[PDB]
Amino acid sequence: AADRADILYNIRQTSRPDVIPTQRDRPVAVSVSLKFINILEVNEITNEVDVVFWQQTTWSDRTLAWDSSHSPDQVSVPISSLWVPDLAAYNAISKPEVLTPQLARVVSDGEVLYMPSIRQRFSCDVSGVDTESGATCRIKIGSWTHHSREISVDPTTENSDDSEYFSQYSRFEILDVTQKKNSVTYSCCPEAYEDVEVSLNFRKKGRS
Amino acid sequence: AADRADILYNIRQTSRPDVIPTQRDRPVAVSVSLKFINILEVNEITNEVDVVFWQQTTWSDRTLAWDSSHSPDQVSVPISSLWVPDLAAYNAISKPEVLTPQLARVVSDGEVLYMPSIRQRFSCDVSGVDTESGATCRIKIGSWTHHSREISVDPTTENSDDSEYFSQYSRFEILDVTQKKNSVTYSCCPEAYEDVEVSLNFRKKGRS
Amino acid sequence: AADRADILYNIRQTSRPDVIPTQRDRPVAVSVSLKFINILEVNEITNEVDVVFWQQTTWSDRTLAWDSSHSPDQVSVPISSLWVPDLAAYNAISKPEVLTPQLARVVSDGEVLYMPSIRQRFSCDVSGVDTESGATCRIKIGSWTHHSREISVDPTTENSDDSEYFSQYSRFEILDVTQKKNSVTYSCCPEAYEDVEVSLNFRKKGRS
Amino acid sequence: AADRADILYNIRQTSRPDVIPTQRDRPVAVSVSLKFINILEVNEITNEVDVVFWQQTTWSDRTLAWDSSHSPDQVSVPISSLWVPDLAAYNAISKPEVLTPQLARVVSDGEVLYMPSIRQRFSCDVSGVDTESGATCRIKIGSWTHHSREISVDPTTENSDDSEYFSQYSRFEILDVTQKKNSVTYSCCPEAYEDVEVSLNFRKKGRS
Amino acid sequence: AADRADILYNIRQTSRPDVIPTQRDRPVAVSVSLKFINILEVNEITNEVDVVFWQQTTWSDRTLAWDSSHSPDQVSVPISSLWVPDLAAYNAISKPEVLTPQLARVVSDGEVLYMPSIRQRFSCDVSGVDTESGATCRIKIGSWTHHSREISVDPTTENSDDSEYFSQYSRFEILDVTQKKNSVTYSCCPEAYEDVEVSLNFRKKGRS
Ligand SMILES: N#C/N=C1\SCCN1Cc1ccc(Cl)nc1
Ligand SMILES: N#C/N=C1\SCCN1Cc1ccc(Cl)nc1
Ligand SMILES: N#C/N=C1\SCCN1Cc1ccc(Cl)nc1
Ligand SMILES: N#C/N=C1\SCCN1Cc1ccc(Cl)nc1
Ligand SMILES: N#C/N=C1\SCCN1Cc1ccc(Cl)nc1
């Protein structure tokens, strides 16, 4: 029977923003899917590209669930009130530029959806952008401090159109986008960190 | 008899900045109206524009109302102490740069007016900007996380001149500006999100 | 009987930074006078200017008064501890860049002086900058959300040289500066808002 | 029997971010190791480079130690909640830009690991970058305010690869990176401050 | 018998960051000495220079004093926990870019030292930079809101090398550095404000 103000007030009491909601000591499964909106400044010479995309991030936080029999089953909450995967583009050369309100969608069962529009610059393979096969820029996104046992990242497998969200007014066109999964590991640290490798195949429009 | 201090103190007591002020299941009615102030940069090749506009935003938050029969019926309040629509430009390629003091005007009847001066960059149709008929850049603005059942957005038609606020020193000129209501929906999300579609018809100024 | 630490204490106990210190229900008299220090990146084709100035701002706030018969009559105080006029340049195209500590000077009688050095870009008339008559760039500054009945702004007329503070190293030189008070109103809003119009007549320094 | 929520609570409640965690009267032993990921901009004329590197930083704080007999032995914690070494690149000409979530890992034994990905500009020898022997840009990093008696700096002792983390799409390549321990001192200050002189020997990729 | 935590806690208990540490109506004596590290982005046409210096700043607050006979006689403390002179470069045209941790050194006798490394752009005389006699760029730094009877500044003119800290990889070199005390006053304000005028004599490097 509680209103929306109550659902939020109760989230502040149960939600520990700095505590990863690990349950039955099993990694938190984070789903990550980049919705490409536009490809801006491209420099084949320096192998750098500016990209705008909506990062659809979904996961479950047990400590957030509530009874929605006699009340709203969803509310928007500031990400500062909840725990959020500490994801990062392993090959980014600029910090992520969040262009939208930093609010996440929370379902009464604990399901969380955070989908910010992000603009960011990447260090990838730009060669071939001005060709028919185009270039394929690969973006590695995974947790920065939570190894495979605390966080698992998997791409949301859905055959949705690759350029469904892509701006028609962009100078470039998307040929294909494949989001695979991997597990990076270095000599700095023993364990392995999961990541989703998003390969963006694009090229310039209006070519001869 | 009460001063402005009482009105503010009262707002700090009832205002819930992180909770949408909806009554029943009826969504919050947000009115959006853009007053174009300047068109700074335009790129015919990349289809990008840098513009300055005043985003006239109004809505109702009855949980803020107060008795003004013997006190001011309006006060300027910092937006941080109020709930504000999580509006965003769906095709912006830069974060909104707010140029003015972040204060809203609150009327004793619960009405809220927030009109910031914003400089922002968009990806839109720039073709024809050098012709007499000009270019037509469409800017879509709507709630980012609140679907139609939660937030409604509509323009504000009138007999106002599209150049009433426009700078005469700009390199461009406005031909016509029409703001229509529209709705967006992606395969990411089931429900639909209302948005105001602002069509800016402008061209570069001639030796005239 | 009191020291600078006690003054600050009492100030923090009576000052209401988010409440305009209305006196007798009359509008707060705000005085503003720009002291030009430099003219930097000028562009006659885009009618854009980048200038640096000290914005001399004064007003009265009775709620800050204190007896200084045998105590300091003046103290520097962070602006966050005081109410400040929500002033904005109506034709600015970049946010004000405050180059100095944000401290204000408060006198025991309630007089407040805030004079920050600001770097900011404006949209204004730059035509003729490289001619002998020079260009005349007009900058409009006034309250953003407080109308005439709440705040009043007038140029702090004081016998002084137009380039008393102007850098001798600028590529440009000031020919004249006239600061006149005015008023603005739009079909958006019923009441009027006061502003000060600063006309900066300048030109690129010749050679021979 | 305590979970991560309990551990995080304890750490946050025990950590003293402003107090150097000096065990006994010995200095705090900090280990620093730069893992270069890219060399973005290089200017031989101005001897200035723009580089992206992960700064492996480790130290100990016994106050955070907890019993992990039947509890996690590592947790992610925001650095704002921990004391962190006040490291500064002595030859940096721009503030370090942290591109990743500012979280550190704290082991149950009080061991702390913080490894952010940082983009920063340095003033260093770039002459010879376009030769087979390449250029050797040396970067000095150490405590800014804690001398040898309070903080000691040593390069992560380990025979590792220099290009392991390096981007294959960079316009440059790494020939060698020798990170040697060192010390600095000036007439300003009588004591000595330890640092880690990192020698970056790199050159531009051949057109082949 | 007091650890560094106790020294900080005492400081946190008596320090008044927003209150100048005045002693018997005498002005606080602040010492300022710039150590040049690099000279970059120089423009003889616009008379603007980018400079990087270690602004050595010292003053005294004897209320923070403690007995260090058998306790550390120095501690590093965040400036946010201390009162710091509101110093400003009068002819700077960009805000100060602080490149180092913002920590100060408090000594057991009440002395405080703050020496951040700063990168800032200035408006000054750059003419003659490419000549043997080089150019002389003057930089003024003094209190922004505290007049002569509240704050006094003087250069720590000692017997040191002007290029002791100066980078050998800079395109320029220092011929001489004279740091003299000085004062300023404008029609705006009745009292005078002290400042140290640093005359930097530098020229480009040209093996000829
Ligand atoms: N393997 C490995 N290392 C990885 S994968 C993603 C980030 N890292 C390095 C790292 C690991 C832990 C911390 Cl606190 N900071 C940086
Ligand atoms: N349809 C759809 N999706 C839309 S319309 C406007 C924004 N979005 C995406 C979205 C939806 C929900 C959240 Cl919490 N964040 C982003
Ligand atoms: N007329 C009019 N409108 C003016 S004059 C100066 C600023 N404005 C717009 C405005 C009016 C009210 C608020 Cl809360 N915000 C912006
Ligand atoms: N010698 C010397 N000085 C050094 S080595 C590393 C930094 N410094 C300068 C310094 C020393 C102390 C403080 Cl509080 N701030 C800056
Ligand atoms: N003379 C004079 N005025 C000076 S010297 C250095 C700064 N100023 C102006 C000033 C004076 C007082 C305040 Cl609160 N803010 C700025």
Short mmCIF file of C-alpha atoms and ligand atoms in Angstrom, two decimals, chain B residues 54 74-77 100-101 103-106 113-117 164-165, chain C residues 86 88 90 142-146 184-195, ligand 3:
data_model
loop_
_atom_site.label_atom_id
_atom_site.label_comp_id
_atom_site.label_asym_id
_atom_site.label_seq_id
_atom_site.Cartn_x
_atom_site.Cartn_y
_atom_site.Cartn_z
CA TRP B 54 16.20 28.45 -22.98
CA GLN B 74 6.21 32.84 -5.46
CA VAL B 75 9.85 32.18 -4.54
CA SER B 76 13.02 31.19 -6.39
CA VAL B 77 14.33 27.86 -5.10
CA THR B 100 22.45 30.07 -15.70
CA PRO B 101 21.81 29.88 -11.92
CA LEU B 103 16.97 27.91 -9.62
CA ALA B 104 13.32 27.16 -10.22
CA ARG B 105 10.36 29.44 -9.61
CA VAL B 106 7.74 27.88 -7.34
CA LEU B 113 8.95 26.74 -13.59
CA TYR B 114 12.52 25.86 -14.46
CA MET B 115 13.98 27.68 -17.48
CA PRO B 116 17.71 27.18 -17.85
CA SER B 117 19.78 28.64 -20.66
CA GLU B 164 11.64 36.63 -30.27
CA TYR B 165 14.64 35.57 -28.17
CA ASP C 86 21.47 34.93 -9.10
CA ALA C 88 23.67 35.91 -15.34
CA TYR C 90 21.82 37.03 -21.03
CA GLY C 142 20.88 40.83 -14.43
CA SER C 143 18.90 38.47 -12.16
CA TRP C 144 17.83 35.22 -13.79
CA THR C 145 14.75 34.34 -11.69
CA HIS C 146 14.03 37.45 -9.56
CA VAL C 184 13.74 42.93 -20.28
CA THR C 185 10.48 41.03 -20.68
CA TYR C 186 9.27 38.12 -22.78
CA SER C 187 5.97 36.49 -23.69
CA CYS C 188 7.08 33.66 -21.41
CA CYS C 189 6.80 35.68 -18.34
CA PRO C 190 4.32 38.38 -17.15
CA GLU C 191 6.64 40.50 -15.01
CA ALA C 192 9.87 42.24 -16.04
CA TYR C 193 13.49 41.54 -15.03
CA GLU C 194 16.08 44.30 -14.52
CA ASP C 195 19.49 44.16 -16.14
N1 LIG F 3 10.98 37.87 -19.53
C1 LIG F 3 11.64 36.98 -19.18
N2 LIG F 3 12.32 36.03 -18.82
C2 LIG F 3 13.52 36.11 -18.37
S1 LIG F 3 14.38 37.52 -18.17
C3 LIG F 3 15.86 36.82 -17.54
C4 LIG F 3 15.61 35.30 -17.49
N3 LIG F 3 14.25 35.06 -17.99
C5 LIG F 3 13.76 33.68 -18.05
C6 LIG F 3 13.48 32.96 -16.75
C7 LIG F 3 12.36 33.31 -15.93
C8 LIG F 3 12.12 32.59 -14.73
C9 LIG F 3 12.99 31.54 -14.37
CL1 LIG F 3 12.71 30.59 -12.88
N4 LIG F 3 14.06 31.23 -15.18
C10 LIG F 3 14.32 31.91 -16.33
#
